Design a protein around this ligand. Structure first.
Ligand SMILES: *[C@@H]1O[C@H](CO)[C@@H](O)[C@H](O)[C@H]1NC(C)=O
Ligand SMILES: *[C@@H]1O[C@H](CO)[C@@H](O)[C@H](O)[C@H]1NC(C)=O
Ligand SMILES: *[C@@H]1O[C@H](CO)[C@@H](O)[C@H](O)[C@H]1NC(C)=O
Ligand SMILES: *[C@@H]1O[C@H](CO)[C@@H](O)[C@H](O)[C@H]1NC(C)=O
Ligand SMILES: *[C@@H]1O[C@H](CO)[C@@H](O)[C@H](O)[C@H]1NC(C)=O
Ligand SMILES: *[C@@H]1O[C@H](CO)[C@@H](O)[C@H](O)[C@H]1NC(C)=O
Ligand SMILES: [Zn+2]
Lengths: 595, 193
């Protein structure tokens, strides 16, 4: 009996036991989220504890195999997934310290109450009020006050915690045969052992920088346009050759520019295509919304929803009789059980949300035959890419006209496509530099290229160099600006939003070319096409059993990220922006300051 | 008139597990095969060696009826010349089968809220079974070079696993009752007609 046969037998037993055990935990979590009570919390906690204990005890037996004597790729991948030690190689007291640090950072961010000098008992917390006072506000002093106060209050309480967090995670990564914790994060895009599709952990940085170099000119033009319009909005506050202040971007951090559409609209007289009135006039409901999206997937050539999907899913708000979480979610409980949790209203946004969630569900159903540990996307950025490409084709005017939501007496105008493209670019292309700079900063901090006496200075000069955003007032080294974000204080990776954005348009262009589209890329529709559906299913069926480079070549025909489809998508807006930027300066100077 | 007792193997309160399947002999009676249509919705009604119509104009020495409960995914393995986890370790049909395999969904009887762990199947048998062999032995399976001393641990596994049927799985993982009828026409006078 060779060690490989023993590994296969162990994997069979583990698969059966894990498939039996994980369903109970998933069902308990669904029961708690659907119906919030006290017994449900206890049941969910017990199921989670049992699942975690089983996984730990199976990993402990899993390290028994050398893994150097296995010639089968599937067994090697499953054993590699099972054999990872995680946060257990380090000592026990250090583990308790790390857990306590994580918990205290999480609760500090969660509570984060902020008072005001106007009245001792007029405090505004983060999720209500502060987001409103930073998004829909127009006053300079008020939003400046909010931006300074929240960040000063939060960041001057997490710096000692964050330093110990960093050193403990670096120690754990070093004990796990990794250079640093940033390398531990980067290890998700690593493919080795397959000739012709070999990927290194260090190639990700080079590829990301190569893509950003091509991205930069369009961002510069959009930034110049927004700068001119916002200078028209704010008199005697924005230098024409300087950088945009941080607190004027419509968000606490500047992640999205989608709230700047009101100030920056090409042709404000023409309104965008809103369908809610047409949906209400025809007496639509949540059932009709989720039946018109199933037909979209059927017309492409993909399977339709199972019989239990309609019986078990919650597609309407239960009301005040019982409390449920309103966040839309696609649930894969396993053993052929797929559900969707959503509180659907009769609006146009819920149409696209339903399409996104059903795209998630179809992706989950695609690889239901794979082993338990190989039932996932090829990497962390394919679920969202598929969801967004599904929701992208259902918003075109042609699709709305086909389903009758738009009157046949309707023709697109050249003043509407530009406006729609700019509105979408304020959300899509306006977030790439932020994500890139944040992830680069955390990678540099983890690697140690930034000494502890240079955190804030390096942060706020990289912000000026890469993003083109200047701080309102100087911040001392006692501040922790990046910790204000949700994804920084809760130990989440922040690079999937870049690769996912690129994959969106790569997949969209591939499916557009497969469907014989004739016009521009922003009016493409994959409905009624079966070859595109077959080509997509060829990759969806793989799951996580093959390298993501091979899957990308299966769909697109290339083995690496490419930004050309995004530029093809945004070309008309780019030409219009170049046309309108004849009498303005493109670029910014970092030496200029507002203080 | 003396009719064969097809109401005892088709309509029974409880069936048997796959590894210990129930076999019954039928002889010296009059077979009314159209009665088998009293249920009506049948997930599988395959017949090998005989016409799709049952041809009530046939006489055989005796009939054998085998009953068990499997998943909906494993119904396709009950066929001559098939490989898998059920056709190799639990129940095998000969390459020259002459009989009919009937299978129907029984989710409302064999599934319970919280699990139904009364149905088991054999795994790691160490060798393929010959046609019509039972093997209800329960001993620790040894996959390795260190002998097991009668107890499980490391490379020593209990051969039988449970199904754990529940409502709200899906037709792939739902209970299915399977009855296999075989006709043995081998010498002697014919007593089943
Ligand atoms: C929610 O849980 C409570 C607590 O037992 C129960 O009484 C109620 O019936 C549940 N509601 C639903 C819809 O299951
Ligand atoms: C790896 O094992 C699986 C079954 O566990 C088998 O189907 C596959 O062919 C094996 N790989 C190779 C390259 O033979
Ligand atoms: C996991 O930790 C155990 C405990 O010493 C060690 O033997 C094993 O080599 C480790 N495996 C990996 C992949 O780090
Ligand atoms: C949904 O799937 C079924 C299952 O084959 C099939 O009849 C068809 O594709 C769909 N049915 C309807 C009524 O749309
Ligand atoms: C797709 O096919 C359906 C039915 O064949 C048809 O009604 C519709 O106009 C076609 N086009 C779109 C964009 O739905
Ligand atoms: C139940 O038994 C009757 C005979 O009493 C039979 O006609 C019917 O088919 C049985 N139901 C089954 C086998 O589901
Ligand atoms: Zn999503």
């Amino acid at each position: 009996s060779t060690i490989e046969e023993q590994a296969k037998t162990f994997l069979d037993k583990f698969n059966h036991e894990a498939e039996d055990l994980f369903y109970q935990s998933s069902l308990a979590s669904w029961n708690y989220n659907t119906n919030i009570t006290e017994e449900n919390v206890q049941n969910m906690n017990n199921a989670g504890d049992k699942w975690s204990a089983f996984l730990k005890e199976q990993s402990t037996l899993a390290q028994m195999y050398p893994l150097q004597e296995i010639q089968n790729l599937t067994v090697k991948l499953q054993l590699q997934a099972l054999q990872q030690n995680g946060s257990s190689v380090l000592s026990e007291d250090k583990s308790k310290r790390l857990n306590t640090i994580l918990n205290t950072m999480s609760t500090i961010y969660s509570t984060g109450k902020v008072c005001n000098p106007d009245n001792p008992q007029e405090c505004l917390l983060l999720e209500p009020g502060l987001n409103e006072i930073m998004a829909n506000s127009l006053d300079y002093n008020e939003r400046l006050w909010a931006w300074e106060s929240w960040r000063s209050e939060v960041g001057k309480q997490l710096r000692p915690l964050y330093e110990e967090y960093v050193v403990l995670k670096n120690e754990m990564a070093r004990a796990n045969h990794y250079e640093d914790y940033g390398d531990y994060w980067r290890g998700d895009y690593e493919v080795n052992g397959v000739d012709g599709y070999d990927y290194s952990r260090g190639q990700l940085i080079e590829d990301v920088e190569h893509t950003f170099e091509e991205i930069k000119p369009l961002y510069e033009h959009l930034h110049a346009y927004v700068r001119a319009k916002l200078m028209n909005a704010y008199p005697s506050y924005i230098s024409p050759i300087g950088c945009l202040p941080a607190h004027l971007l419509g968000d606490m951090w500047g992640r999205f520019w989608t709230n700047l559409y009101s100030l920056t609209v090409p042709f404000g007289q023409k309104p965008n295509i809103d369908v809610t009135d047409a949906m209400v006039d025809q007496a639509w409901d949540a059932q009709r919304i989720f039946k018109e999206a199933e037909k979209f997937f059927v017309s492409v050539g993909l399977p339709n929803m199972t019989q239990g999907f309609w019986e078990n899913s919650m597609l309407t708000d239960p009301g005040n009789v019982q409390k449920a979480v309103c966040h839309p979610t696609a649930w894969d409980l396993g053993k052929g059980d797929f559900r969707i949790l959503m509180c659907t209203k009769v609006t146009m946004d819920d149409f696209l949300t339903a399409h996104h969630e059903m795209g998630h569900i179809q992706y989950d159903m695609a690889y239901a035959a794979q082993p338990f540990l190989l039932r996932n996307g090829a990497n962390e950025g394919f679920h969202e890419a598929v969801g967004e490409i599904m929701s992208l084709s259902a918003a075109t005017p042609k699709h709305l006209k086909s389903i009758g939501l738009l009157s046949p007496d309707f023709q697109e105008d050249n003043e509407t496509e530009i406006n729609f493209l700019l509105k979408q670019a304020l959300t899509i292309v306006g977030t790439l530099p932020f994500t890139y700079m944040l992830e680069k900063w955390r990678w540099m901090v983890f690697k140690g290229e930034i000494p502890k006496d240079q955190w804030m200075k390096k942060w706020w000069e990289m912000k000026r160099e890469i993003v083109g955003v200047v701080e309102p007032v100087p911040h001392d080294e006692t501040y922790c600006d990046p910790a204000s974000l949700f994804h920084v204080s809760n130990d989440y990776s922040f690079i999937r939003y870049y690769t996912r954005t690129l994959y969106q348009f790569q997949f969209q262009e591939a499916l557009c070319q497969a469907a014989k589209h004739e016009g521009p890329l922003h009016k493409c529709d994959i409905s009624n096409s079966t070859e595109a559906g077959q080509k997509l299913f060829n990759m969806l069926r793989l799951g996580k059993s093959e390298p993501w480079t091979l899957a990308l070549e299966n769909v697109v025909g290339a083995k690496n990220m490419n930004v050309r489809p995004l530029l093809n998508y945004f070309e008309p807006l780019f030409t219009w922006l170049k046309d309108q930027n004849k009498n303005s300066f493109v670029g910014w100077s970092t030496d200029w300051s507002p203080y | 008139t003396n009719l064969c007792p097809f109401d005892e193997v088709f309509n029974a309160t409880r069936f048997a597990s796959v590894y210990a399947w129930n076999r019954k002999r039928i002889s010296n009676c009059v077979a009314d095969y159209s009665v088998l249509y009293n249920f009506a919705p049948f997930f599988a009604f395959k017949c090998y060696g005989v016409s799709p119509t049952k041809l009530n104009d046939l006489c055989f020495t005796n009939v054998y009826a085998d009953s068990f409960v499997i998943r909906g995914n494993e119904v396709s393995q009950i066929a001559p010349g098939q490989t898998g986890n059920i056709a190799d370790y639990n129940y095998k049909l000969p390459d020259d089968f002459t009989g009919c395999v009937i299978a129907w969904n029984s989710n409302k009887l064999d599934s319970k809220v919280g699990g139904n762990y009364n149905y088991r199947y054999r795994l790691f048998r160490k060798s393929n079974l010959k046609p019509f062999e039972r093997d209800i032995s329960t001993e620790i399976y040894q996959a390795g070079n260190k002998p097991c001393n009668g107890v499980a641990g490391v490379n020593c596994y209990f051969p039988l696993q449970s199904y754990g049927f529940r409502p709200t799985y899906g037709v792939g993982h739902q209970p299915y009752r399977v009855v296999v009828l075989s006709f043995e026409l081998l010498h002697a006078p014919a007593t089943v007609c």
